[PDB]
């Protein structure tokens, strides 16, 4: 039940293979159509639903998929 924007965020996280995952700057770099609040909300939703988790700190994310 993902919005278009949540799916876009999730796809970017899925595509980063680094063990610490991608970071919030990587999301801002790519998601140039989205407000910072929308990116943050999508990260919250994805994290609450178990699609992603934070890794080395609260600004880095990896997907469970």
């Amino acid at each position: 039940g993902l919005t278009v924007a949540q799916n876009q965020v999730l796809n970017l996280i899925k595509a980063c293979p680094r063990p610490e995952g991608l970071n919030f700057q990587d999301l801002k770099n790519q998601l140039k159509h989205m407000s910072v609040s929308s990116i943050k909300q999508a990260v919250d939703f994805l994290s609450n639903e178990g699609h992603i988790y934070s890794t080395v700190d609260d600004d880095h994310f990896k997907s469970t998929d």
């Binding site: 063990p19 610490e20 994290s47 609450n48 639903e49 178990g50 699609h51 992603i52 988790y53 934070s54 890794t55 080395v56 990896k62 469970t64």
Partner: peptide
Amino acid sequence: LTEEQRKKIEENRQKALARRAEKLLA
């Protein structure tokens, strides 16, 4: 990554997979 960082990441990975299972099961 350091030992400690890998330990924390794996704990986080398991917490998230747990949340996912709960959502898939509800």
